[PDB]
Amino acid sequence: SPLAQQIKNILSLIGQADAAGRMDEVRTLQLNLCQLMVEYFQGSPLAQQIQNIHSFGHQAWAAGRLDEVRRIQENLYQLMKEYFQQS
Ligand SMILES: C[N+](C)(CCCS(=O)(=O)[O-])Cc1ccccc1
Ligand SMILES: [Zn+2]
């Protein structure tokens, strides 16, 4: 529950940073969100989907598969906004 609130706070900060065009701030906030996701999702079908899609995106990034990274990141943001009820 505190972890869920920390995650919601990062999701909102990411939205503000993206709205401002602050891509390096988006980068570092995503790194923080990653830290919290690895801890929170180390359950419901959505929780399992977030864990699986998060893992897939990291494998895609490690393999340099950048189109899939972008699409996975978009989907993962959507899943996280649903799970944590972040508008
Ligand atoms: C619903 N998905 C699991 C995709 C399902 C197969 S489809 O993209 O061909 O429709 C979401 C999704 C997951 C990872 C990347 C992009 C989308
Ligand atoms: Zn991550």
Side-chain angles (χ1 to χ4, degrees):
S1 266
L3 202 53
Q5 197 46 58
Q6 286 186 87
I7 286 172
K8 285 173 65 56
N9 292 343
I10 297 287
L11 290 173
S12 190
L13 290 179
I14 289 167
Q16 302 178 25
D18 186 68
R22 292 200 186 272
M23 297 300 101
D24 194 73
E25 191 168 22
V26 173
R27 182 186 69 90
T28 57
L29 291 163
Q30 283 186 346
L31 290 168
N32 299 344
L33 182 68
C34 180
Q35 292 191 243
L36 297 184
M37 284 173 69
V38 178
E39 172 89 354
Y40 189 96
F41 295 108
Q42 51 182 264
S44 59
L46 179 57
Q48 269 186 248
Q49 188 70 7
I50 291 166
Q51 294 175 61
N52 291 343
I53 295 307
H54 179 243
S55 172
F56 177 39
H58 277 287
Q59 292 218 240
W61 174 248
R65 301 301 296 147
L66 305 179
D67 292 311
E68 201 54 33
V69 168
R70 168 181 73 258
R71 304 170 191 138
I72 292 164
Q73 178 166 134
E74 179 185 31
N75 183 252
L76 192 53
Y77 269 120
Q78 190 46 40
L79 299 177
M80 287 286 286
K81 289 184 187 171
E82 300 163 0
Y83 189 91
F84 291 97
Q85 288 291 289
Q86 263 288 111
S87 299

Coordinates of all heavy atoms in Angstrom, one line a residue:
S1 N 0.8 -1.2 0.0 CA 0.0 0.0 0.0 C 0.8 1.3 0.0 O 0.5 2.2 -0.7 CB -1.0 0.0 1.1 OG -2.3 -0.4 0.6
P2 N 1.9 1.4 0.8 CA 2.8 2.5 0.6 C 3.6 2.3 -0.7 O 3.8 3.3 -1.4 CB 3.7 2.4 1.8 CG 3.2 1.3 2.7 CD 2.3 0.5 1.9
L3 N 3.9 1.1 -1.1 CA 4.6 0.9 -2.3 C 3.7 1.2 -3.5 O 4.1 1.8 -4.5 CB 5.0 -0.6 -2.4 CG 6.1 -0.9 -3.4 CD1 7.3 -0.1 -3.1 CD2 6.5 -2.4 -3.3
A4 N 2.4 0.9 -3.4 CA 1.4 1.3 -4.4 C 1.3 2.8 -4.5 O 1.2 3.3 -5.6 CB 0.0 0.7 -4.1
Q5 N 1.4 3.5 -3.4 CA 1.3 5.0 -3.5 C 2.6 5.5 -4.1 O 2.5 6.5 -4.9 CB 1.0 5.6 -2.1 CG 0.6 7.0 -2.2 CD -0.5 7.2 -3.2 OE1 -1.6 6.6 -3.2 NE2 -0.3 8.1 -4.2
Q6 N 3.7 5.0 -3.8 CA 5.0 5.4 -4.4 C 4.9 5.3 -5.9 O 5.4 6.1 -6.7 CB 6.1 4.6 -3.9 CG 6.6 4.9 -2.4 CD 7.8 4.1 -2.0 OE1 8.9 4.5 -2.3 NE2 7.6 2.9 -1.4
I7 N 4.3 4.1 -6.4 CA 4.2 3.9 -7.8 C 3.3 4.8 -8.5 O 3.6 5.4 -9.5 CB 3.8 2.4 -8.0 CG1 5.0 1.4 -7.7 CG2 3.2 2.2 -9.4 CD1 4.6 0.0 -7.7
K8 N 2.1 5.1 -7.8 CA 1.2 6.1 -8.4 C 1.8 7.5 -8.5 O 1.6 8.2 -9.5 CB -0.1 6.1 -7.5 CG -1.0 5.0 -7.7 CD -2.1 5.0 -6.6 CE -3.0 6.2 -6.8 NZ -3.6 6.3 -8.2
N9 N 2.7 7.8 -7.5 CA 3.3 9.1 -7.5 C 4.3 9.2 -8.7 O 4.5 10.3 -9.3 CB 4.0 9.4 -6.2 CG 3.0 9.6 -5.1 OD1 1.8 9.8 -5.3 ND2 3.5 9.5 -3.8
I10 N 5.0 8.1 -9.0 CA 6.0 8.1 -10.1 C 5.2 8.2 -11.4 O 5.6 8.9 -12.3 CB 6.9 6.9 -10.0 CG1 7.8 7.0 -8.7 CG2 7.8 6.8 -11.2 CD1 8.9 8.0 -8.8
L11 N 4.1 7.4 -11.5 CA 3.4 7.4 -12.8 C 2.9 8.9 -13.1 O 3.0 9.3 -14.2 CB 2.2 6.5 -12.7 CG 2.5 5.0 -12.7 CD1 1.2 4.1 -12.4 CD2 3.1 4.6 -14.0
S12 N 2.4 9.6 -12.0 CA 2.0 10.9 -12.3 C 3.1 11.9 -12.7 O 3.0 12.7 -13.6 CB 1.2 11.5 -11.1 OG 0.6 12.7 -11.4
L13 N 4.3 11.7 -12.0 CA 5.5 12.5 -12.4 C 5.9 12.2 -13.8 O 6.3 13.1 -14.5 CB 6.6 12.2 -11.4 CG 6.4 12.7 -10.0 CD1 7.6 12.4 -9.1 CD2 6.2 14.2 -10.0
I14 N 5.8 11.0 -14.2 CA 6.2 10.6 -15.6 C 5.3 11.4 -16.6 O 5.7 11.9 -17.6 CB 6.2 9.1 -15.8 CG1 7.4 8.5 -15.1 CG2 6.2 8.8 -17.3 CD1 7.3 7.0 -14.9
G15 N 4.0 11.4 -16.3 CA 3.1 12.1 -17.2 C 3.4 13.6 -17.3 O 3.3 14.1 -18.4
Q16 N 3.7 14.2 -16.2 CA 4.1 15.6 -16.2 C 5.4 15.8 -16.9 O 5.5 16.8 -17.7 CB 4.2 16.1 -14.7 CG 3.0 16.0 -13.9 CD 3.2 16.5 -12.5 OE1 4.1 17.3 -12.2 NE2 2.5 15.9 -11.5
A17 N 6.3 15.0 -16.7 CA 7.6 15.1 -17.4 C 7.4 14.9 -18.9 O 8.0 15.7 -19.7 CB 8.6 14.1 -16.9
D18 N 6.6 13.9 -19.4 CA 6.4 13.8 -20.8 C 5.7 15.0 -21.3 O 6.0 15.4 -22.5 CB 5.6 12.5 -21.0 CG 5.4 12.2 -22.5 OD1 6.4 11.8 -23.1 OD2 4.2 12.3 -23.0
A19 N 4.7 15.5 -20.6 CA 4.0 16.7 -21.0 C 4.9 17.9 -21.2 O 4.6 18.8 -22.0 CB 2.8 17.0 -20.0
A20 N 5.9 18.0 -20.4 CA 6.9 19.1 -20.5 C 8.0 18.9 -21.5 O 8.8 19.8 -21.7 CB 7.5 19.3 -19.1
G21 N 8.0 17.7 -22.1 CA 9.1 17.4 -23.0 C 10.5 17.2 -22.4 O 11.5 17.4 -23.0
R22 N 10.4 16.6 -21.1 CA 11.7 16.4 -20.4 C 12.0 14.9 -20.4 O 11.7 14.2 -19.5 CB 11.5 16.9 -18.9 CG 11.3 18.4 -18.8 CD 11.6 18.8 -17.4 NE 11.4 20.2 -17.1 CZ 12.2 21.2 -17.3 NH1 13.5 20.9 -17.8 NH2 11.9 22.5 -17.1
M23 N 12.7 14.6 -21.6 CA 12.9 13.2 -21.8 C 13.9 12.5 -20.9 O 13.9 11.4 -20.6 CB 13.3 12.9 -23.3 CG 12.3 13.3 -24.3 SD 10.8 12.4 -24.1 CE 9.7 13.6 -23.3
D24 N 14.9 13.3 -20.4 CA 15.9 12.7 -19.5 C 15.2 12.5 -18.1 O 15.5 11.6 -17.4 CB 17.2 13.5 -19.4 CG 18.2 12.7 -18.6 OD1 18.8 11.8 -19.2 OD2 18.5 13.1 -17.4
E25 N 14.3 13.4 -17.7 CA 13.5 13.2 -16.5 C 12.6 12.0 -16.7 O 12.4 11.2 -15.7 CB 12.7 14.4 -16.1 CG 12.1 14.3 -14.7 CD 11.6 15.6 -14.2 OE1 11.2 16.5 -14.9 OE2 11.4 15.6 -12.9
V26 N 12.0 11.8 -17.9 CA 11.2 10.6 -18.1 C 12.1 9.4 -17.9 O 11.7 8.4 -17.3 CB 10.5 10.6 -19.5 CG1 9.9 9.2 -19.7 CG2 9.5 11.7 -19.6
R27 N 13.4 9.4 -18.5 CA 14.3 8.3 -18.3 C 14.5 7.9 -16.9 O 14.4 6.8 -16.5 CB 15.6 8.6 -19.0 CG 16.6 7.5 -19.0 CD 17.9 7.9 -19.5 NE 18.6 8.9 -18.6 CZ 19.4 8.5 -17.7 NH1 19.7 7.2 -17.5 NH2 20.0 9.4 -16.9
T28 N 14.9 8.9 -16.1 CA 15.2 8.6 -14.7 C 14.0 8.2 -13.9 O 14.1 7.3 -13.1 CB 16.0 9.7 -14.0 OG1 15.2 11.0 -14.1 CG2 17.3 9.9 -14.7
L29 N 12.8 8.8 -14.1 CA 11.6 8.4 -13.4 C 11.2 7.0 -13.8 O 10.7 6.2 -13.0 CB 10.5 9.4 -13.7 CG 10.6 10.8 -13.1 CD1 9.6 11.7 -13.8 CD2 10.3 10.7 -11.6
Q30 N 11.5 6.6 -15.1 CA 11.2 5.2 -15.5 C 12.1 4.3 -14.8 O 11.7 3.2 -14.4 CB 11.3 5.1 -17.0 CG 10.2 5.6 -17.8 CD 10.3 5.3 -19.2 OE1 11.4 4.9 -19.7 NE2 9.3 5.5 -20.0
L31 N 13.4 4.7 -14.5 CA 14.3 3.8 -13.8 C 13.8 3.7 -12.4 O 13.9 2.6 -11.8 CB 15.7 4.4 -13.8 CG 16.4 4.4 -15.2 CD1 17.7 5.2 -15.2 CD2 16.8 2.9 -15.5
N32 N 13.2 4.7 -11.8 CA 12.6 4.6 -10.4 C 11.4 3.7 -10.4 O 11.3 2.9 -9.6 CB 12.3 6.0 -9.9 CG 13.5 6.9 -9.8 OD1 14.6 6.4 -9.8 ND2 13.2 8.2 -9.6
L33 N 10.5 3.9 -11.4 CA 9.4 3.1 -11.5 C 9.8 1.6 -11.7 O 9.1 0.7 -11.1 CB 8.5 3.5 -12.8 CG 7.2 2.8 -13.0 CD1 6.2 3.0 -11.9 CD2 6.7 3.1 -14.4
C34 N 10.9 1.3 -12.4 CA 11.3 0.0 -12.6 C 11.7 -0.6 -11.2 O 11.4 -1.7 -10.9 CB 12.5 0.0 -13.6 SG 13.2 -1.7 -13.9
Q35 N 12.5 0.2 -10.5 CA 12.9 -0.3 -9.1 C 11.7 -0.7 -8.3 O 11.7 -1.7 -7.7 CB 13.6 0.9 -8.4 CG 14.9 1.4 -8.9 CD 15.6 2.3 -7.9 OE1 15.8 3.5 -8.2 NE2 15.8 1.8 -6.7
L36 N 10.6 0.1 -8.3 CA 9.4 -0.2 -7.6 C 8.7 -1.4 -8.1 O 8.1 -2.1 -7.4 CB 8.5 1.0 -7.4 CG 9.2 2.2 -6.7 CD1 8.2 3.3 -6.6 CD2 9.7 1.8 -5.4
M37 N 8.6 -1.5 -9.5 CA 7.9 -2.6 -10.1 C 8.6 -3.9 -9.8 O 7.9 -5.0 -9.6 CB 7.8 -2.4 -11.6 CG 6.8 -1.4 -12.0 SD 6.8 -1.1 -13.7 CE 6.2 -2.7 -14.3
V38 N 10.0 -4.0 -9.8 CA 10.6 -5.2 -9.5 C 10.4 -5.7 -8.1 O 10.3 -6.9 -7.8 CB 12.2 -5.1 -9.8 CG1 12.9 -6.3 -9.5 CG2 12.4 -4.7 -11.3
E39 N 10.2 -4.7 -7.2 CA 9.9 -5.0 -5.8 C 8.4 -5.4 -5.6 O 8.1 -6.4 -4.9 CB 10.2 -3.8 -4.9 CG 9.8 -3.9 -3.4 CD 10.8 -4.5 -2.6 OE1 11.9 -5.0 -3.1 OE2 10.6 -4.6 -1.3
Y40 N 7.5 -4.6 -6.2 CA 6.1 -4.9 -6.0 C 5.6 -6.2 -6.6 O 4.8 -6.9 -6.0 CB 5.3 -3.7 -6.5 CG 3.8 -3.7 -6.2 CD1 3.3 -3.0 -5.1 CD2 2.9 -4.4 -7.0 CE1 2.0 -3.0 -4.8 CE2 1.6 -4.4 -6.7 CZ 1.1 -3.7 -5.6 OH -0.2 -3.7 -5.4
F41 N 6.1 -6.5 -7.8 CA 5.7 -7.6 -8.6 C 6.7 -8.7 -8.7 O 6.9 -9.3 -9.7 CB 5.3 -7.2 -10.1 CG 4.2 -6.2 -10.2 CD1 4.4 -4.9 -10.5 CD2 2.9 -6.7 -10.0 CE1 3.3 -4.0 -10.6 CE2 1.8 -5.8 -10.2 CZ 2.0 -4.5 -10.4
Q42 N 7.4 -8.9 -7.6 CA 8.5 -9.9 -7.6 C 7.9 -11.3 -7.7 O 6.8 -11.5 -7.3 CB 9.4 -9.8 -6.3 CG 8.5 -9.8 -5.1 CD 9.4 -9.6 -3.8 OE1 9.7 -10.5 -3.2 NE2 9.7 -8.3 -3.5
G43 N -1.1 -14.2 -7.9 CA -1.8 -12.9 -8.0 C -2.8 -12.8 -9.1 O -3.0 -13.8 -9.8
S44 N -3.4 -11.6 -9.2 CA -4.4 -11.4 -10.2 C -3.9 -11.6 -11.6 O -2.7 -11.5 -11.9 CB -5.0 -10.0 -10.1 OG -4.0 -9.0 -10.3
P45 N -4.7 -11.9 -12.6 CA -4.2 -12.0 -14.0 C -3.5 -10.8 -14.5 O -2.6 -10.8 -15.2 CB -5.5 -12.3 -14.8 CG -6.4 -13.0 -13.8 CD -6.1 -12.3 -12.5
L46 N -4.0 -9.6 -14.1 CA -3.4 -8.3 -14.5 C -2.0 -8.2 -13.9 O -1.0 -7.8 -14.5 CB -4.2 -7.1 -14.2 CG -3.6 -5.8 -14.5 CD1 -3.3 -5.7 -16.0 CD2 -4.6 -4.7 -14.2
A47 N -1.9 -8.6 -12.6 CA -0.6 -8.5 -11.9 C 0.4 -9.4 -12.6 O 1.6 -9.0 -12.8 CB -0.7 -8.8 -10.4
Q48 N 0.0 -10.6 -13.0 CA 0.8 -11.5 -13.7 C 1.2 -11.0 -15.1 O 2.4 -11.1 -15.5 CB 0.1 -12.9 -13.9 CG 0.3 -13.9 -12.8 CD -0.3 -15.2 -13.1 OE1 -1.3 -15.6 -12.5 NE2 0.2 -15.9 -14.2
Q49 N 0.2 -10.4 -15.8 CA 0.5 -9.8 -17.1 C 1.5 -8.7 -17.0 O 2.4 -8.6 -17.8 CB -0.8 -9.3 -17.7 CG -0.6 -8.8 -19.1 CD -0.4 -9.9 -20.1 OE1 -0.5 -11.1 -19.7 NE2 -0.1 -9.6 -21.3
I50 N 1.4 -7.8 -16.0 CA 2.4 -6.8 -15.8 C 3.8 -7.4 -15.6 O 4.8 -6.9 -16.1 CB 2.0 -5.8 -14.6 CG1 0.8 -5.0 -15.0 CG2 3.2 -4.9 -14.3 CD1 0.1 -4.3 -13.9
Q51 N 3.9 -8.4 -14.7 CA 5.2 -9.0 -14.5 C 5.8 -9.6 -15.8 O 7.0 -9.4 -16.1 CB 5.1 -10.2 -13.5 CG 4.7 -9.7 -12.1 CD 4.5 -10.8 -11.2 OE1 5.4 -11.6 -10.9 NE2 3.3 -10.9 -10.6
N52 N 4.9 -10.3 -16.6 CA 5.4 -10.9 -17.8 C 5.8 -9.9 -18.9 O 6.8 -10.0 -19.5 CB 4.3 -11.9 -18.3 CG 4.1 -13.0 -17.4 OD1 5.0 -13.3 -16.5 ND2 3.0 -13.7 -17.5
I53 N 5.0 -8.9 -19.0 CA 5.2 -7.9 -20.0 C 6.5 -7.0 -19.6 O 7.3 -6.6 -20.5 CB 4.0 -7.0 -20.3 CG1 2.9 -7.8 -20.8 CG2 4.3 -5.8 -21.2 CD1 3.3 -8.6 -22.1
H54 N 6.6 -6.8 -18.3 CA 7.8 -6.0 -17.9 C 9.1 -6.8 -18.2 O 10.1 -6.3 -18.7 CB 7.7 -5.8 -16.4 CG 8.8 -5.1 -15.8 ND1 9.7 -5.7 -14.8 CD2 9.4 -3.9 -16.0 CE1 10.6 -4.8 -14.5 NE2 10.4 -3.7 -15.2
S55 N 9.0 -8.1 -17.9 CA 10.2 -9.0 -18.2 C 10.5 -9.0 -19.7 O 11.7 -8.9 -20.1 CB 9.9 -10.4 -17.7 OG 11.0 -11.3 -18.2
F56 N 9.4 -9.1 -20.5 CA 9.6 -9.2 -22.0 C 10.2 -7.9 -22.5 O 11.1 -7.9 -23.3 CB 8.2 -9.4 -22.5 CG 8.1 -9.4 -24.0 CD1 9.0 -10.0 -24.8 CD2 6.9 -8.8 -24.6 CE1 8.9 -9.9 -26.2 CE2 6.7 -8.8 -26.0 CZ 7.7 -9.4 -26.8
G57 N 9.8 -6.7 -22.0 CA 10.4 -5.5 -22.4 C 11.9 -5.4 -22.1 O 12.6 -4.8 -22.9
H58 N 12.2 -5.9 -20.9 CA 13.7 -5.8 -20.6 C 14.5 -6.8 -21.5 O 15.6 -6.4 -21.8 CB 13.9 -6.2 -19.1 CG 13.7 -5.0 -18.2 ND1 14.6 -3.9 -18.1 CD2 12.6 -4.6 -17.4 CE1 14.1 -3.0 -17.3 NE2 12.9 -3.4 -16.9
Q59 N 13.9 -7.9 -21.8 CA 14.6 -8.8 -22.8 C 14.7 -8.1 -24.1 O 15.7 -8.2 -24.8 CB 13.9 -10.1 -22.8 CG 14.1 -10.9 -21.6 CD 14.3 -12.4 -21.8 OE1 13.5 -13.2 -21.4 NE2 15.3 -12.7 -22.6
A60 N 13.6 -7.4 -24.5 CA 13.7 -6.7 -25.8 C 14.8 -5.7 -25.8 O 15.5 -5.5 -26.8 CB 12.3 -6.1 -26.1
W61 N 14.8 -4.9 -24.7 CA 15.8 -3.8 -24.7 C 17.2 -4.4 -24.7 O 18.1 -3.9 -25.4 CB 15.6 -3.0 -23.4 CG 16.6 -1.9 -23.2 CD1 17.5 -1.9 -22.1 CD2 16.8 -0.8 -23.9 NE1 18.3 -0.8 -22.2 CE2 17.9 -0.1 -23.3 CE3 16.2 -0.2 -25.1 CZ2 18.4 1.2 -23.8 CZ3 16.7 1.0 -25.5 CH2 17.8 1.7 -24.9
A62 N 17.5 -5.5 -24.0 CA 18.8 -6.1 -24.0 C 19.2 -6.6 -25.3 O 20.4 -6.6 -25.7 CB 18.8 -7.3 -22.9
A63 N 18.2 -7.1 -26.1 CA 18.5 -7.5 -27.5 C 18.4 -6.4 -28.5 O 18.6 -6.7 -29.7 CB 17.5 -8.6 -27.9
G64 N 18.3 -5.2 -28.1 CA 18.3 -4.1 -29.0 C 17.1 -4.0 -30.0 O 17.2 -3.4 -31.0
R65 N 16.0 -4.6 -29.6 CA 14.8 -4.7 -30.5 C 13.9 -3.5 -30.1 O 12.9 -3.6 -29.4 CB 14.1 -6.1 -30.3 CG 15.1 -7.2 -30.6 CD 15.6 -7.1 -32.1 NE 14.4 -7.2 -33.0 CZ 14.3 -6.6 -34.1 NH1 15.2 -5.8 -34.6 NH2 13.2 -6.8 -34.9
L66 N 14.2 -2.4 -30.7 CA 13.7 -1.1 -30.3 C 12.3 -0.9 -30.6 O 11.5 -0.2 -29.8 CB 14.6 0.0 -30.8 CG 16.1 -0.1 -30.5 CD1 16.9 1.0 -31.1 CD2 16.3 -0.2 -29.0
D67 N 11.8 -1.3 -31.8 CA 10.4 -1.2 -32.1 C 9.5 -1.9 -31.0 O 8.5 -1.4 -30.6 CB 10.1 -1.8 -33.5 CG 10.7 -1.0 -34.6 OD1 10.5 0.3 -34.6 OD2 11.4 -1.5 -35.5
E68 N 9.9 -3.1 -30.7 CA 9.1 -3.9 -29.7 C 9.3 -3.2 -28.3 O 8.3 -3.2 -27.6 CB 9.6 -5.3 -29.7 CG 8.6 -6.3 -29.1 CD 7.2 -6.2 -29.7 OE1 7.0 -6.0 -30.9 OE2 6.2 -6.5 -28.9
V69 N 10.4 -2.7 -28.0 CA 10.6 -2.0 -26.7 C 9.5 -0.9 -26.6 O 8.8 -0.7 -25.6 CB 12.0 -1.4 -26.5 CG1 12.0 -0.4 -25.3 CG2 13.0 -2.5 -26.3
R70 N 9.4 -0.1 -27.7 CA 8.5 1.0 -27.7 C 7.0 0.5 -27.5 O 6.3 1.1 -26.7 CB 8.6 1.9 -28.9 CG 7.5 2.9 -29.1 CD 7.6 3.6 -30.4 NE 7.3 2.9 -31.6 CZ 8.2 2.3 -32.4 NH1 9.5 2.5 -32.2 NH2 7.9 1.6 -33.5
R71 N 6.7 -0.5 -28.2 CA 5.3 -1.0 -28.1 C 5.0 -1.7 -26.8 O 3.9 -1.5 -26.2 CB 5.0 -2.0 -29.3 CG 5.3 -1.4 -30.7 CD 5.3 -2.5 -31.7 NE 5.8 -2.1 -33.0 CZ 6.6 -2.8 -33.8 NH1 7.0 -4.0 -33.4 NH2 6.9 -2.3 -35.0
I72 N 6.0 -2.4 -26.2 CA 5.9 -3.0 -24.9 C 5.7 -1.9 -23.8 O 4.9 -2.0 -23.0 CB 7.1 -3.9 -24.6 CG1 7.1 -5.1 -25.5 CG2 7.1 -4.3 -23.1 CD1 8.5 -5.8 -25.5
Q73 N 6.6 -0.9 -23.9 CA 6.5 0.2 -22.9 C 5.1 0.9 -23.0 O 4.5 1.2 -21.9 CB 7.6 1.2 -23.2 CG 7.6 2.4 -22.3 CD 8.9 3.2 -22.5 OE1 8.8 4.5 -22.6 NE2 10.0 2.6 -22.4
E74 N 4.6 1.1 -24.2 CA 3.3 1.7 -24.3 C 2.2 0.8 -23.6 O 1.4 1.3 -22.8 CB 2.9 1.9 -25.7 CG 1.5 2.5 -25.9 CD 1.1 2.6 -27.4 OE1 1.6 1.8 -28.2 OE2 0.3 3.5 -27.7
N75 N 2.3 -0.5 -23.9 CA 1.3 -1.4 -23.3 C 1.5 -1.5 -21.8 O 0.5 -1.5 -21.0 CB 1.5 -2.8 -23.9 CG 0.5 -3.8 -23.3 OD1 0.8 -4.7 -22.5 ND2 -0.8 -3.6 -23.7
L76 N 2.7 -1.5 -21.3 CA 3.0 -1.6 -19.9 C 2.5 -0.4 -19.1 O 2.0 -0.5 -18.0 CB 4.5 -1.8 -19.7 CG 5.0 -2.2 -18.3 CD1 4.2 -3.5 -17.8 CD2 6.4 -2.5 -18.4
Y77 N 2.7 0.8 -19.7 CA 2.1 2.0 -19.1 C 0.6 1.9 -19.0 O 0.0 2.3 -18.0 CB 2.4 3.2 -19.9 CG 3.7 3.8 -19.5 CD1 4.8 4.0 -20.3 CD2 3.8 4.3 -18.2 CE1 6.0 4.6 -19.9 CE2 5.0 4.9 -17.7 CZ 6.1 5.0 -18.6 OH 7.3 5.6 -18.2
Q78 N -0.1 1.4 -20.0 CA -1.5 1.2 -20.0 C -1.9 0.2 -18.9 O -2.8 0.5 -18.1 CB -2.0 0.7 -21.3 CG -3.5 0.8 -21.5 CD -4.2 2.1 -20.9 OE1 -3.6 3.2 -21.1 NE2 -5.3 2.0 -20.3
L79 N -1.2 -0.9 -18.8 CA -1.5 -1.9 -17.8 C -1.3 -1.4 -16.4 O -2.1 -1.6 -15.5 CB -0.7 -3.2 -17.9 CG -0.8 -4.0 -19.2 CD1 0.2 -5.1 -19.2 CD2 -2.2 -4.5 -19.3
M80 N -0.3 -0.6 -16.2 CA 0.0 0.0 -14.9 C -1.0 1.0 -14.5 O -1.4 1.1 -13.3 CB 1.4 0.6 -14.9 CG 2.6 -0.4 -14.9 SD 2.9 -1.2 -13.3 CE 3.6 0.1 -12.4
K81 N -1.4 1.9 -15.5 CA -2.4 2.9 -15.2 C -3.8 2.2 -14.7 O -4.4 2.7 -13.8 CB -2.6 3.8 -16.4 CG -1.4 4.7 -16.5 CD -1.7 5.7 -17.7 CE -0.4 6.5 -18.0 NZ -0.6 7.3 -19.2
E82 N -4.1 1.1 -15.4 CA -5.3 0.3 -15.0 C -5.1 -0.3 -13.6 O -6.0 -0.1 -12.7 CB -5.6 -0.8 -16.0 CG -5.9 -0.3 -17.4 CD -5.8 -1.3 -18.5 OE1 -5.5 -2.5 -18.2 OE2 -6.0 -1.0 -19.7
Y83 N -4.0 -1.0 -13.3 CA -3.8 -1.7 -12.1 C -3.7 -0.7 -10.9 O -4.3 -0.9 -9.8 CB -2.5 -2.5 -12.1 CG -2.3 -3.4 -11.0 CD1 -2.8 -4.7 -11.0 CD2 -1.6 -3.0 -9.8 CE1 -2.6 -5.6 -9.9 CE2 -1.4 -3.8 -8.8 CZ -1.9 -5.1 -8.8 OH -1.7 -6.0 -7.8
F84 N -3.0 0.5 -11.1 CA -2.9 1.4 -10.0 C -3.9 2.5 -10.1 O -3.8 3.5 -9.2 CB -1.4 1.9 -10.0 CG -0.4 0.9 -9.6 CD1 0.3 0.2 -10.6 CD2 -0.3 0.6 -8.3 CE1 1.1 -0.8 -10.2 CE2 0.6 -0.4 -7.9 CZ 1.3 -1.1 -8.8
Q85 N -4.8 2.5 -11.0 CA -5.9 3.5 -11.1 C -5.3 4.9 -11.2 O -5.7 5.7 -10.4 CB -6.9 3.3 -10.1 CG -7.8 2.0 -10.3 CD -8.7 2.2 -11.5 OE1 -9.7 2.9 -11.5 NE2 -8.4 1.5 -12.6
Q86 N -4.4 5.1 -12.1 CA -3.7 6.4 -12.3 C -4.2 7.0 -13.6 O -4.0 6.4 -14.7 CB -2.2 6.2 -12.4 CG -1.6 6.4 -11.1 CD -1.5 7.9 -10.7 OE1 -2.2 8.3 -9.8 NE2 -0.7 8.6 -11.5
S87 N -4.9 8.2 -13.5 CA -5.3 8.9 -14.7 C -4.3 9.8 -15.3 O -3.9 10.8 -14.6 CB -6.6 9.6 -14.4 OG -7.6 8.8 -14.0
Ligands
LIG1 C1 -2.6 -7.5 -26.0 N1 -1.1 -7.7 -26.1 C2 -0.7 -8.8 -25.3 C3 -0.8 -7.9 -27.5 C4 -1.5 -9.2 -28.1 C5 -1.0 -9.6 -29.4 S1 -1.2 -8.3 -30.7 O1 -0.3 -7.1 -30.4 O2 -0.8 -8.8 -32.1 O3 -2.7 -7.9 -30.7 C6 -0.5 -6.4 -25.7 C7 0.8 -6.1 -26.1 C8 1.9 -6.6 -25.3 C9 3.2 -6.4 -25.7 C10 3.5 -5.5 -26.8 C11 2.4 -4.9 -27.5 C12 1.1 -5.2 -27.1
ZN2 ZN 11.9 -2.4 -15.5

